[PDB]
């Protein structure tokens, strides 16, 4: 009876649809205009390096599916989600010499293959079969299991809790090679780097748990 | 972030009202301009409902058509046409373009076969002067006419941003699968070929929600920028793919590609698409650039509700070198056969230079 | 608080007519100036039912209409005039002024260019702030030797009338494109328009604006500024009908910015949305301001008439007006090097300079001072 009168009146699970879609179209205008800060201009342009903590008004019948420190990791995700969409369009809204093109075909593909990885096969794969089991719920508590197995799972195949320091830190790393190529337009000091890094990222995921081999081609 | 089109000569208002009909019969907007009852962004394509075309004989037949509410032969001569009217209409592109909120492309529809391609070769140079910062792709169809083409190539070699439509291959398929040895009647893939090439753009997704967003991942280098698509479905993601490599399909009369981009519009699942690529690579249907680790990349989207799984790629590849040398080769046939003809000479230069890259883009040694 | 409307000229006295025809049409009143039986505040234009009209040949055209119970061509030729007639009109604009319990504006029609306009309406301009100096006194003034009326009256409105141009030039255009009649009995139709919704606040009782003060003080902040024009889009929400107001489209007009505009709305629409609209077109940034004093735009809601959908007038203060002059002033002087003491007409061109000097410095950070 309980979920029956919560799919409308107090709406939890249209409320929680929409939490997950305005964020991971519209959210495109909304960075574009923070690569070209305030506290208040962004209000604007949303209701049109790493910080912009973000957050959302959820009512009291569905405030104890939503928890405050459920909030945070939404909030995690999105964080590392934008220096993603950052680097791929950095190195997209341009358009030895013709040697530079070399090395952005080189570069352009590796973040474009890692996009095509967190967003298609996590950030769609998992919500596809959440959706499926939500319209199942059948209890107070379960709904709860349902979605917290929802977030520490996608915390874990998105690496953001553990091994930081031993792989996170490496894909971290070359970012910076996103953004120190994007300002300039030394070259050769850069593949030596390039070789390196993208090698040393292959010879450590190397290990592989067994999820990370759908990118390890590449 | 809009994008505007322009419809040049017979050919190009032909083949752009045909796209603008199949357009507003997927969207839910009756032919008469009005929303009709019965979850898409359409401000990209549509102003509140009339579209941003710019129609440049057969004005008459459009007219004529229930969609009213919806709004010589020689190269030099199309270029000496357009300075005529060049401030009468650039200022109907102002008023669009500043009229526009955030302007984002320029998509052309035009034939390069008389006028349309020389008022074509007088809009790029135009468009590049004034809009620096103004995306130009072209949706160009190919076949005293290897003159007018050569030109139009010279133009296009260095002006426009970015797509190859040949009528013989498009004649081909218009006999195999169709069996019908007509005009009114290829185009209708053509639209279907230019639909759904911008299914991301008109159905938001959570990738590819710019137009540049799509092409520059295939052009590695401003020169090479020339594209080739293919529609096969006239079944799993495996087996889509599988018929897009044939090239029974491809819309094209050693080689290998640049880099790919498939879309697949269907009620598809995304849990076979990775492994999808996984049997492309070890069966190893197609080959890259010896040089540039180069990628496969494949977007889902949504079928129109108002209207099966289908799907369309778009490639780069070096093949197309052959389509230019057969021209080439058909100029200098009538150049020694029959006020200063030294232009001429000019395009012939540069149209040299980007088929001598092709050749050397597919070599191990494409550095320097 | 009533306002007395003056009429001079033919220009002037043929708009006026199919003015009034136009308001008391909106009202319950029938030609015979008698209440029909078939809320609205009528006393701000009628004396208990008498229009409060003092018109100045086509008198003849005017009771020879069914409303007949409603109540040479050079400067110097209409000043002489005025002169001669002093003391016969005062008596009729005094014995009304007396009349009315609180008098307090003077609309006048003319035209610049018509010469009776260009040379008794200029004369009235300087008699009425002698006589009366607590009076504002506001003019529908239109744009059309047809060079030396148009400046040599615009000496006198620039100290005088402490308030509307209408170009002639953009009317007959906007015939052309969307009305299609190739004459001045078609062009007036859509004048009558303006300066109906122009008092639509005043007819019906509302919050604010309830005088001529409480819609122009916010628009003149110096004595200088003092040129407004004015835009109307049907020829549907709140956020439709202001996207065609800033259209350069639709305004009769032939860097720059803005001064203060104000919003006319006589549609039934929602009021809640309104806070809406105004957010999305300072995002779309459409329109550009002073960055020096203080400003805002404005929006007001009326009731269209329910005797006789939503209409909409917009009143604007732009500095691109400055240019209008230009191009006259332009062609005075033109005709200074090709043709008792020539004087009067020497010292009105220095005094217009100011004016002109006075907008183009405007629209820099330091206008102040």
Same mark, same amino acid.
């Given at each position: 009876?309980?979920?029956?009168?919560?799919?409308?009146?107090?709406?939890?699970?249209?409320?929680?649809?929409?939490?997950?879609?305005?964020?991971?179209?519209?959210?495109?205008?909304?960075?574009?205009?923070?690569?070209?800060?305030?506290?208040?201009?962004?209000?604007?342009?949303?209701?049109?390096?790493?910080?912009?903590?973000?957050?959302?008004?959820?009512?009291?019948?569905?405030?104890?599916?939503?928890?405050?420190?459920?909030?945070?990791?939404?909030?995690?995700?999105?964080?590392?989600?934008?220096?993603?969409?950052?680097?791929?369009?950095?190195?997209?809204?341009?358009?030895?010499?013709?040697?530079?093109?070399?090395?952005?075909?080189?570069?352009?593909?590796?973040?474009?293959?890692?996009?095509?990885?967190?967003?298609?096969?996590?950030?769609?794969?998992?919500?596809?079969?959440?959706?499926?089991?939500?319209?199942?719920?059948?209890?107070?508590?379960?709904?709860?299991?349902?979605?917290?197995?929802?977030?520490?799972?996608?915390?874990?195949?998105?690496?953001?809790?553990?091994?930081?320091?031993?792989?996170?830190?490496?894909?971290?790393?070359?970012?910076?090679?996103?953004?120190?190529?994007?300002?300039?337009?030394?070259?050769?000091?850069?593949?030596?780097?390039?070789?390196?890094?993208?090698?040393?990222?292959?010879?450590?995921?190397?290990?592989?748990?067994?999820?990370?081999?759908?990118?390890?081609?590449? | 972030?809009?994008?505007?089109? !322009? +419809?040049?000569?017979?050919?190009?208002?032909?083949?752009?009202?045909?796209?603008?009909?199949?357009?507003?019969?997927?969207?839910?907007?009756?032919?008469?301009?009005?929303?009709?009852?019965?979850?898409?962004?359409?401000?990209?394509?549509?102003? +509140?409902?009339?579209?941003?075309?710019?129609?440049?004989?057969?004005?008459?037949?459009?007219?004529?058509?229930?969609?009213?509410?919806?709004?010589?032969?020689?190269?030099?001569?199309?270029? $000496?046409?357009?300075?005529?009217?060049?401030?009468?209409?650039?200022?109907?592109?102002?008023?669009?373009?500043?009229?526009?909120?955030?302007?984002?492309?320029?998509?052309?529809?035009?034939?390069?076969?008389?006028?349309?391609?020389? !008022?074509?070769?007088?809009?790029?140079?135009?468009?590049?002067?004034?809009?620096?910062?103004?995306?130009?792709?072209?949706?160009?169809?190919?076949?005293?006419?290897?003159?007018?083409?050569?030109?139009?190539?010279?133009?296009?070699?260095?002006?426009?941003?970015?797509?190859?439509?040949?009528?013989?291959?498009?004649?081909?398929?218009?006999?195999?699968?169709?069996?019908?040895? $007509?005009?009114?009647?290829?185009?209708?893939?053509? $639209?279907?070929?230019?639909?759904? %090439?911008?299914?991301?753009?008109?159905?938001?997704?959570?990738?590819?929600?710019?137009?540049?967003?799509? =092409?520059? %991942?295939?052009?590695?280098?401003?020169? !090479?920028?020339?594209?080739?698509?293919?529609?096969?479905?006239?079944?799993?993601?495996?087996?889509?793919?599988?018929?897009?490599?044939?090239?029974?399909?491809?819309?094209?009369?050693?080689?290998?590609?640049?880099?790919?981009?498939?879309? =697949?519009?269907?009620?598809?699942?995304?849990?076979?698409?990775?492994?999808?690529?996984?049997?492309?690579?070890?069966?190893?249907?197609?080959?890259?650039?010896?040089?540039?680790?180069?990628?496969?990349?494949?977007?889902?989207?949504?079928?129109?509700?108002?209207?099966?799984?289908?799907?369309?790629?778009?490639?780069?590849?070096?093949?197309?070198?052959?389509?230019?040398?057969?021209?080439?080769?058909?100029?200098?046939?009538?150049?020694?056969?029959?006020?200063?003809?030294?232009?001429?000479?000019?395009?012939?230069? =540069?149209? +040299?230079?980007?088929?001598?890259?092709?050749?050397?883009?597919?070599?191990?040694?494409?550095?320097?």
């Amino acid at each position: 009876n309980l979920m029956q009168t919560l799919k409308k009146d107090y709406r939890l699970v249209e409320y929680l649809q929409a939490m997950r879609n305005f964020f991971l179209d519209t959210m495109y205008d909304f960075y574009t205009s923070i690569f070209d800060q305030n506290v208040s201009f962004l209000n604007v342009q949303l209701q049109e390096l790493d910080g912009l903590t973000l957050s959302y008004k959820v009512p009291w019948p569905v405030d104890i599916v939503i928890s405050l420190e459920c909030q945070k990791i939404y909030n995690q995700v999105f964080l590392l989600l934008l220096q993603i969409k950052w680097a791929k369009y950095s190195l997209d809204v341009l358009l030895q010499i013709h040697r530079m093109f070399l090395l952005r075909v080189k570069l352009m593909h590796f973040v474009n293959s890692l996009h095509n990885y967190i967003m298609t096969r996590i950030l769609h794969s998992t919500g596809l079969e959440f959706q499926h089991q939500v319209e199942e719920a059948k209890d107070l508590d379960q709904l709860i299991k349902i979605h917290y197995r929802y977030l520490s799972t996608i915390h874990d195949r998105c690496l953001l809790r553990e091994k930081v320091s031993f792989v996170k830190e490496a894909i971290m790393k070359v970012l910076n090679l996103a953004l120190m190529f994007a300002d300039g337009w030394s070259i050769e000091k850069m593949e030596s780097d390039f070789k390196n890094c993208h090698m040393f990222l292959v010879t450590i995921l190397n290990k592989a748990f067994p999820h990370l081999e759908s990118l390890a081609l590449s | 972030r809009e994008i505007i089109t !322009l +419809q040049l000569g017979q050919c190009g208002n032909q083949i752009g009202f045909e796209f603008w009909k199949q357009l507003c019969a997927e969207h839910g907007i009756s032919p008469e301009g009005i929303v009709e009852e019965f979850t898409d962004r359409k401000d990209v394509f549509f102003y +509140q409902y009339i579209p941003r075309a710019v129609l440049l004989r057969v004005i008459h037949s459009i007219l004529n058509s229930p969609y009213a509410k919806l709004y010589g032969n020689n190269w030099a001569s199309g270029f $000496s046409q357009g300075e005529k009217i060049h401030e009468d209409i650039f200022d109907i592109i102002d008023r669009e373009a500043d009229g526009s909120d955030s302007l984002e492309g320029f998509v052309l529809c035009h034939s390069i076969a008389g006028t349309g391609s020389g !008022l074509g070769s007088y809009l790029l140079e135009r468009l590049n002067d004034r809009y620096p910062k103004k995306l130009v792709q072209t949706y160009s169809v190919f076949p005293v006419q290897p003159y007018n083409s050569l030109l139009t190539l010279k133009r296009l070699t260095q002006n426009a941003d970015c797509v190859v439509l040949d009528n013989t291959a498009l004649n081909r398929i218009a006999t195999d699968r169709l069996h019908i040895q $007509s005009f009114s009647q290829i185009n209708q893939l053509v $639209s279907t070929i230019m639909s759904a %090439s911008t299914t991301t753009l008109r159905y938001p997704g959570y990738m590819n929600n710019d137009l540049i967003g799509l =092409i520059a %991942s295939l052009i590695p280098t401003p020169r !090479l920028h020339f594209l080739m698509t293919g529609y096969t479905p006239l079944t799993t993601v495996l087996d889509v793919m599988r018929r897009l490599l044939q090239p029974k399909n491809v819309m094209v009369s050693n080689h290998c590609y640049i880099a790919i981009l498939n879309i =697949i519009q269907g009620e598809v699942d995304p849990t076979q698409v990775h492994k999808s690529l996984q049997r492309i690579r070890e069966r190893k249907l197609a080959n890259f650039i010896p040089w540039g680790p180069a990628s496969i990349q494949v977007a889902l989207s949504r079928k129109s509700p108002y209207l099966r799984v289908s799907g369309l790629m778009m490639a780069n590849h070096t093949s197309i070198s052959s389509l230019f040398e057969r021209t080439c080769r058909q100029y200098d046939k009538l150049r020694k056969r029959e006020d200063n003809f030294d232009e001429m000479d000019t395009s012939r230069e =540069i149209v +040299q230079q980007l088929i001598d890259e092709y050749h050397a883009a597919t070599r191990p040694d494409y550095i320097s």
